[PDB]
Design a protein around this nucleic acid. Structure first.
Lengths: 69, 454, 108, 459, 49, 90
RNA sequence: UCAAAGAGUGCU
C-alpha cells in the first residue's frame, strides 16, 4: 500500500503483510536444538557421549568447523 | 425482438479534458452498502481514537505572569482578546491575549488585590478602564490606552480613588450603568461620580466575601458571606431579597448568561451547586468531581458549560445538564487554581494559579483555531454526531473516558470513595431498626436553612 | 460540491414528470447534460464560455417546457415548481460566473 | 409520543430523500422484451444478440481458446475490471479483459482448484495442490499459507479483509490478509466441503456437505449458526443473491431448491432437472443461472415467494403462469465448470474445458454502481486511496453475526501466618452478616404476605 | 470585528471585504499563521469588492 | 430433591420450532456483551427511542447530500472571532 | 514503453 500518514499509522499498525538465508538458518538452529537436547541427557550416558562426538566429526568433515571443538 | 443492454458512454465517465473532474455516480440502494451498523460503529471507534491523539489543550501563558500568586481575573465582556489580572504583590496587569503581552502594569495597592473588574465608566474606543479593590481600604479606577482603533492622534494611569472605612474583599460592576458594588465588611453600592458609597446594602453584621451581578436581569445581585450564606439583592428595590445558609462556605458565584434565573456556586465541600433564583430550597444540579475546595466557577457564554478551578490543582469542565465533568486539565507547574474564565467566544479557558502564571487552554482539546474547508467541517461534524450516537458502547467509553489524572487526585478519590461507602453502610444498618429516619435528597443536604419559607 | 447542485434539480425534475410534460427517459437525458455542465463549472480550467453554454442549454429547456405546456396541458402557466425553476437556475449560473470572472464585461 | 414520533419523521424524510436521488442515476438496465406473443425469449441465440448490440458490447463477449490446461475456473474482480482464470493443470492468468492487458500468467506444474482476488486486483490467492499461495499483481509469490491445506474453495470478505478456505479435511479457516494471522479455524465435522458461498449482506459463510445439509458459519463461533437440509445427497453448488435474502442450492440428486435465508423458509423445489446441476449463480438483478453439463439455463423473476415464480423447464401449452427459462445456451461437446456474472455488466462468464466464454445476458448486471464502494473507472490514485480507507474501516471478525444489525442495543514467618488468620475471620464475618440480612428480608416478605390446644397455646 | 480592508498599490486602491474573521486569542498559533501563507486558506478570509 | 438448571432456551421458546429442515443453535447466537450499550444515550429519553435512531444510518453511503447536512449539524453553532453577548430581553 | 512505488510544483 502507499505510505501511511502520521495519523493512519497510529490507528493501524503492522498492516504491511502481503539474499535469503532461511535454510542455512534452519541448519544452525537445528544443530543448536540437537546440542541442547543432548545436554539435557545424563552426562554419563554412553549414547549421549557417542552422538555428540559424531556431531563434532560431521561438522569437522563438512568444514564448517575449521578446527576440532 | 426488443434487445437493450447496459451501454456506457466513455465520455460520460472519463472526461475528455485532463483537467475536468470525473463524474462520481452514486446509487443509494441499500443492497450496495452492507454493514451499515458495523461500519458506523467502527468509524465512531476510530474517531474516538483520533480525538485522544489530537487532544492538546494547553496553548500558552500570558507573558511572564505575576511576581506573586494570581488571585483576581477580570474579563472585558465587550472585547474578546482583553484580560485584567491582579496578584498578591499588589500589582494589576491588563493583557492582550492575542499577542500574550501586557498593555500596562500598575503597582495599584499596598495590600492584596482582593477584587478586579473591567468597566466602561459613564463620567458626567481609545481607552479601557478597570476597577481594583484591596484590603488597604481603597478602590482605584484606572485607564489603559488600547490599540483597538486608530481614530485619534493618553492620560493613562490612576483616574479616581474611593476611600473606605473597612477592607474591600470583592468588586463587580453593573452591566448597563456605571454603578459598581464592593463587598467587604459591608456590601456597598457605588457610583463612579461620587467618592462615598451611594447605598449601603447588608443583611446584618456579617461580612461579604464575594459578589456577582446578574448578566440579563441586570438589577439582581448575589453575594457570599463568611457565615456560609448566599444573599440575593435587587437594585430596583435597593434591598436584599432572599438568604439561604449552606453547610460550608461558597467561594464564587456565576450567573447563567442564557437563563437569567439560574446561577452556579463554587463551594468548599468539593462541590459546585446549580441553583434557581425563584426556588432556593433545593439545587438544580450538583457537580462532584473535585477532591479539594472549588475556588472559582464560570459559565460559557453559550450557557451550556461551566468550568471549575479547585485547590487540588486541576480545572474541570462540566455540561450544565450532567453531574460529572467531561474533562480535567492539569500541569506540574500549576499549583492552586484560584480563577477560571471563559473567553467571550467560548473557545478558550483562562486560569490563574498561585504560582503566578495566567495560562490559556482549549475548551475542547481536540479542536483547532484555523479556518477549515467544507470537506473538513463536514467530516469533523460527522464524527461528533457519530461519537454522540455510540457514547455508551463498552469500548468507546473506555477510550473516551480515560484521562491521565495526577496520582494525588486519583488517590484522594479512592480514599474519598471508601469514606462515602463507610457512611452509606452505616446509615443502611441504622434503617433496619430506626422507625423515623427520613430520606434526605442529595439536592437538599447542603442547605442548612432559608429565611423566607415557601 | 457538485452533488449539492445536482440534488437541487430533483424537485423540478419530479414536477416535470408528474405534470406529464417530460417522460422519465427524457428527464434522464436532461439531467445527464446538467451533470456534465456542473462538473465542467466546478473543475480547473473552467472558462466563461462554459457558463455561457450552460446558460444557453438551460434556456432551451425552458422553451421546450413552455411549448409542451400548451401542447399537452393546454395551459399557459401550470401552478407548480417547474414554471420558475429554470429561470431561477439561470440567474444562479450568472451569479456564479460573474463572481468567478469579474473581468469579463461581456458576461456582465 | 412526541419523542418517538419526531424520530419517525426524521426517518421517513431520510428514506424519501434517498429515493428521490434515483432521478440522478446515469443509466438503466437492459432487457429482452418479446414483441409478439409467439416470439419466445429463450429462443434468442447469442448470434442474434451480438448483431443487435453495439460494437463495445460485442467486443466484451470474449472467447478464449485454451485447449491444454483446462478445465478453467473463472472469477471476476468485484468491480468487473479484471478476470482471474485458473486451469486445472496449473495455468493461472490475471488480466484486464477489456484493454487486453495481461497482469500475470503462472504456469505452475500442479493441480490448481480455484483462485480469488483479494481487496483489489493487485493481490490474489490460488488454492493449489496441498497449499494456498498468494501472488502479486505481476505474479510474484508473496506467501504460502502452510495452515490452509487441501483447500478447494476460496472466498474473500472485502469489508472484513478475511480470506476463507475449505476443503476435504473438514476445516473452515479464516485468514486476515492485512495482518497475516490465522483469525479462526473451525472443524466442520461433516466430511469434505462440497460447495462454499458467502452471504454479502451479513458475511456469514454457507458450506455444503455430503449429508445434504447447508451449515452457516461465523469466525468467532465454534459451531455452525444454522443447519439447513436442502438435498437428499451432496450439495454441489450454493448461490446467494446480493441482498442476502435468497439462497439457491443444487444437489447431486437432480434437485434445485430456492431458500428464504432470513426466515429460513424453502420457497421452491425444482425436481424436474433432467441431469444433476453443477453450478448456480445469481446476478445483481436477480437472474438465476443453472449449468447442467453442457447446458446453461437462466430464469428471470424466479427468486420470489409466489408459486408462479417457480422455475420450469419448457412450458405446458404456453401457460403464462409457468416460469419458462429466460435464456439458454448449449456448449456442444463441452462441460461447464463454473459460472460468473460480470459485475455491472450484462454478461455471464463461463469457465469450461476449452477455455472461457462470456454470454451476453440483457438485464443481468447492475447498470448503476456506486463509485464510493466500487468504481470500474477507478484510477490508480483512487485505487490506492480506496485501499487505505477500506483498511482503516476494517470490520472486526467478531462483529460477524446472523443479524448484521445487532450492534448497539441497551444492556514473614509468623507474621504472614497471623495475617492469614485475621483475613479468614474477616471473610467469615462478611458471610455471617450477609446471612442475617437475607433472613431479615425473608421476614419482611412473610409479614407482607382442638380446644385443648387453644388452652395450652400460651405455653 | 473587521468587515472591510483598504490596501494601497502602486497601480491603485483596492478595497476588500472580510468574509470570515480569524481567531484573535489564537492569532499566534502556528496553524492560523500558516493560513496566511496558504492562498487557498487566505481567500476564505477576504474577497475583493 | 430436584434443582432446575436454566438452559440456553426453553424447548418451547426455540426459533427453529415450526421450521422444518432447520436447526438454529441458540447457544452460539447469543448477543455479544461487547457491542451492547450500557445505557440509553442523551437526548433519547427511552430505550425504544434509542433503538429507532440506530435504524437510520447517518453516513453518506446511505443518505443524500442534503439529508446528510441536516443530520450532522450540531445544536450549538457559533461563528469565530465574535463575542457572544448575554441574551437580550425578549 | 507499460507496470507497480516515492518526492516537489501549479491549480479547484
Amino acid at each position: 500500500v502507499r505510505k501511511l500518514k502520521h495519523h493512519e499509522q497510529k490507528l493501524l499498525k503492522k498492516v504491511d503483510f502481503l539474499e535469503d538465508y532461511h535454510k542455512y538458518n534452519r541448519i544452525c538452529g537445528d544443530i543448536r536444538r540437537l546440542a541442547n537436547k543432548l545436554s539435557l541427557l545424563p552426562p554419563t550416558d554412553p549414547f549421549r557421549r557417542k552422538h555428540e562426538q559424531l556431531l563434532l566429526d560431521k561438522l569437522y568433515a563438512m568444514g564448517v568447523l575449521t578446527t576440532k571443538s | 425482438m426488443k434487445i437493450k443492454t447496459i451501454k456506457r458512454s466513455a465520455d460520460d465517465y472519463v472526461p475528455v479534458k485532463s483537467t475536468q473532474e470525473s463524474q462520481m455516480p452514486r446509487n443509494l440502494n441499500p443492497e450496495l452498502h452492507p454493514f451499515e451498523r458495523a461500519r458506523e460503529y467502527t468509524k465512531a471507534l476510530n474517531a474516538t481514537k483520533l480525538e485522544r491523539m489530537f487532544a492538546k489543550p494547553f496553548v500558552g501563558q500570558l507573558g511572564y505572569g505575576h511576581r506573586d500568586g494570581v488571585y483576581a481575573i477580570a474579563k472585558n465582556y465587550g472585547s474578546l482578546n482583553k484580560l485584567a489580572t491582579g496578584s498578591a504583590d499588589g500589582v494589576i496587569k491588563y493583557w492582550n491575549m492575542s499577542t500574550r503581552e501586557e498593555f500596562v502594569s500598575f503597582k495599584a495597592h499596598y495590600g492584596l488585590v482582593t477584587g478586579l473588574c473591567v468597566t466602561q465608566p459613564r463620567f458626567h474606543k481609545s481607552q479601557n478602564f478597570m476597577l481594583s479593590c484591596s484590603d488597604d481600604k481603597t478602590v482605584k479606577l484606572w485607564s489603559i490606552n488600547v490599540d483597538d482603533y486608530s481614530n485619534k492622534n493618553n492620560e493613562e494611569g490612576l483616574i479616581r480613588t474611593f476611600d473606605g472605612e473597612s477592607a474591600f474583599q470583592g468588586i463587580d460592576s453593573h452591566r448597563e450603568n456605571s454603578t459598581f458594588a464592593t463587598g467587604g465588611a459591608k456590601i456597598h453600592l457605588w457610583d463612579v461620580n461620587r467618592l462615598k458609597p451611594v447605598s449601603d446594602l447588608s443583611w446584618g453584621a456579617d461580612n461579604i466575601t464575594s459578589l456577582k451581578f446578574n448578566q440579563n436581569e441586570t438589577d439582581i445581585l448575589a453575594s457570599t458571606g463568611s457565615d456560609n450564606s448566599i444573599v440575593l439583592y435587587d437594585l430596583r428595590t435597593n434591598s436584599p431579597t432572599q438568604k439561604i445558609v449552606q453547610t460550608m462556605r461558597t467561594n464564587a458565584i456565576c450567573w447563567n448568561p442564557m437563563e437569567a434565573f439560574n446561577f452556579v456556586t463554587a463551594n468548599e465541600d468539593h462541590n459546585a451547586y446549580y441553583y434557581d433564583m425563584r426556588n432556593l430550597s433545593r439545587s438544580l444540579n450538583v457537580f462532584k468531581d473535585h477532591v479539594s475546595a472549588v475556588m472559582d466557577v464560570d459559565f460559557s457564554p453559550t450557557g451550556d458549560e461551566i468550568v471549575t478551578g479547585s485547590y487540588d490543582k486541576s480545572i474541570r469542565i462540566y455540561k450544565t445538564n450532567h453531574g460529572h465533568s467531561r474533562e480535567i486539565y492539569h500541569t506540574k507547574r500549576m499549583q492552586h487554581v484560584f480563577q477560571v474564565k471563559y473567553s467571550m467566544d467560548s473557545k478558550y479557558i483562562i486560569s490563574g494559579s498561585d504560582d503566578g502564571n495566567v495560562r490559556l487552554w482549549r475548551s475542547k482539546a481536540w479542536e483547532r483555531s484555523n479556518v477549515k474547508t467544507t470537506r473538513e467541517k463536514n467530516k469533523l461534524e460527522y464524527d461528533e454526531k457519530l461519537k454522540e450516537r455510540f457514547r455508551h458502547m463498552p469500548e468507546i467509553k473506555r477510550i473516551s473516558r480515560h484521562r491521565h489524572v495526577p496520582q494525588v487526585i486519583k488517590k484522594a478519590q479512592e480514599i474519598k470513595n471508601i469514606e462515602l461507602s463507610s457512611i452509606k453502610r452505616r446509615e443502611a444498618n441504622e434503617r433496619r431498626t430506626r422507625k423515623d429516619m427520613p430520606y434526605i435528597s442529595e439536592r437538599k443536604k447542603q442547605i442548612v436553612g432559608t429565611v423566607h419559607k415557601y | 460540491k457538485t452533488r449539492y447542485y445536482l440534488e437541487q434539480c430533483i424537485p423540478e425534475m419530479d414536477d416535470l414528470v408528474e405534470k406529464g410534460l417530460f417522460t422519465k427517459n427524457e428527464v434522464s437525458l436532461i439531467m445527464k447534460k446538467r451533470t456534465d455542465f456542473e462538473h465542467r463549472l466546478n473543475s480547473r480550467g473552467s472558462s466563461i464560455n462554459d457558463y455561457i453554454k450552460y446558460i444557453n442549454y438551460e434556456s432551451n429547456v425552458n422553451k421546450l417546457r413552455a411549448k409542451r405546456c400548451k401542447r399537452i396541458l393546454q395551459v399557459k402557466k401550470t401552478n407548480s415548481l417547474s414554471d420558475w425553476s429554470i429561470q431561477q437556475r439561470i440567474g444562479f449560473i450568472y451569479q456564479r460566473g460573474t463572481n468567478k470572472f469579474p473581468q469579463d464585461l461581456k458576461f456582465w | 409520543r412526541a419523542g418517538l414520533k419526531k424520530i419517525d419523521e426524521q426517518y421517513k424524510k431520510a428514506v424519501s430523500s434517498a429515493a428521490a436521488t434515483d432521478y440522478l442515476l446515469p443509466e438503466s438496465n437492459g432487457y429482452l422484451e418479446p414483441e409478439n406473443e409467439l416470439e419466445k425469449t429463450f429462443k434468442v441465440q447469442q448470434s442474434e444478440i451480438k448483431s443487435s448490440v453495439d460494437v463495445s458490447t460485442a467486443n466484451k463477449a470474449l472467447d478464449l481458446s485454451l485447449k491444454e490446461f483446462g478445465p478453467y475456473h473463472i472469477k471476476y474482480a468485484k468491480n468487473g475490471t479484471h478476470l482471474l482464470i485458473t486451469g486445472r493443470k496449473g495455468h493461472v492468468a490475471s488480466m484486464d479483459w477489456r484493454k487486453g492487458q495481461l497482469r500475470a500468467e503462472l504456469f505452475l506444474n500442479e493441480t490448481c482448484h480455484s483462485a480469488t482476488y483479494l481487496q483489489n486486483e493487485q493481490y490474489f490467492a490460488v488454492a493449489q495442490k496441498k497449499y494456498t499461495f498468494i501472488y502479486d499483481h505481476e505474479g510474484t509469490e508473496l506467501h504460502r499459507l502452510k495452515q490452509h491445506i487441501e483447500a478447494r474453495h476460496l472466498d474473500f470478505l472485502p469489508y472484513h479483509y478475511l480470506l476463507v478456505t475449505a476443503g476435504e479435511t473438514g476445516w473452515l479457516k479464516y485468514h486476515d490478509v492485512s495482518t497475516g494471522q490465522l483469525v479462526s479455524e473451525l472443524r466442520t465435522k461433516a466430511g469434505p466441503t462440497m460447495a462454499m458461498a458467502q452471504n454479502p449482506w451479513n458475511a456469514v459463510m454457507h458450506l455444503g456437505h455430503s449429508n445434504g445439509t447447508v451449515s452457516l458459519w461465523s469466525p468467532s463461533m465454534p459451531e455452525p449458526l444454522v443447519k439447513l437440509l436442502s438435498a437428499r445427497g451432496p450439495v454441489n453448488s450454493i448461490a446467494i443473491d446480493r441482498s442476502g435474502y435468497y439462497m439457491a442450492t443444487t444437489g447431486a440428486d437432480r434437485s434445485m431448491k430456492i431458500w428464504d435465508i432470513r426466515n429460513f423458509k424453502q420457497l421452491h423445489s425444482v425436481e424436474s432437472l433432467p441431469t444433476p446441476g453443477t453450478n448456480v449463480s445469481i446476478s445483481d438483478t436477480g437472474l438465476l443461472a443453472l449449468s447442467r453439463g453442457p447446458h446453461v439455463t437462466l430464469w428471470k423473476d424466479a427468486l420470489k415467494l409466489s408459486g408462479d415464480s417457480k422455475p420450469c423447464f419448457g412450458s405446458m401449452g404456453g401457460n403464462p403462469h409457468r416460469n419458462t427459462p429466460y435464456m439458454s445456451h448449449l456448449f456442444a461437446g463441452n462441460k461447464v465448470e463454473n459460472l460468473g456474472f460480470v459485475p455491472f455488466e450484462d454478461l455471464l462468464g463461463v469457465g469450461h474445458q476449452t477455455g472461457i466464454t462470456n454470454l451476453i445476458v440483457p438485464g443481468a448486471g447492475e447498470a448503476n454502481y456506486d463509485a464510493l464502494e466500487l468504481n470500474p473507472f477507478e484510477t490508480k490514485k483512487q485505487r490506492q486511496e480506496q485501499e487505505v480507507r477500506t483498511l482503516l474501516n476494517k470490520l472486526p471478525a467478531d462483529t460477524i453475526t446472523l443479524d448484521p444489525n445487532s450492534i448497539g442495543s441497551v444492556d514473614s514467618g509468623l507474621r504472614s501466618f497471623l495475617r492469614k488468620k485475621t483475613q479468614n475471620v474477616i471473610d467469615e464475618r462478611k458471610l455471617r452478616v450477609q446471612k442475617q440480612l437475607d433472613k431479615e428480608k425473608n421476614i419482611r416478605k412473610r409479614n407482607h404476605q382442638d380446644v385443648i390446644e387453644e388452652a395450652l397455646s400460651r405455653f | 470585528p473587521i468587515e472591510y480592508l483598504l490596501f494601497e498599490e502602486p497601480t491603485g486602491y483596492a478595497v476588500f471585504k472580510v468574509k470570515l474573521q480569524q481567531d484573535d486569542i489564537g492569532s499566534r498559533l502556528k496553524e492560523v499563521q500558516e493560513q496566511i501563507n496558504d492562498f487557498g486558506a487566505f481567500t476564505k478570509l477576504i474577497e475583493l469588492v | 430433591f430436584i434443582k432446575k438448571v436454566k438452559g440456553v432456551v426453553n424447548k418451547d421458546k426455540r426459533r427453529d420450532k415450526n421450521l422444518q429442515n432447520v436447526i438454529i443453535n441458540e447457544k452460539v447466537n447469543k448477543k455479544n456483551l461487547k457491542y451492547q450499550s450500557s445505557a440509553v444515550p442523551f437526548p433519547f429519553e427511552n430505550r425504544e427511542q434509542y433503538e429507532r435512531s440506530l435504524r437510520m444510518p447517518i453516513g453518506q453511503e446511505w443518505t443524500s447530500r442534503a439529508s446528510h447536512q441536516e443530520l450532522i449539524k450540531p445544536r450549538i453553532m457559533t461563528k469565530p472571532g465574535q463575542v457572544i453577548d448575554p441574551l437580550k430581553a425578549p
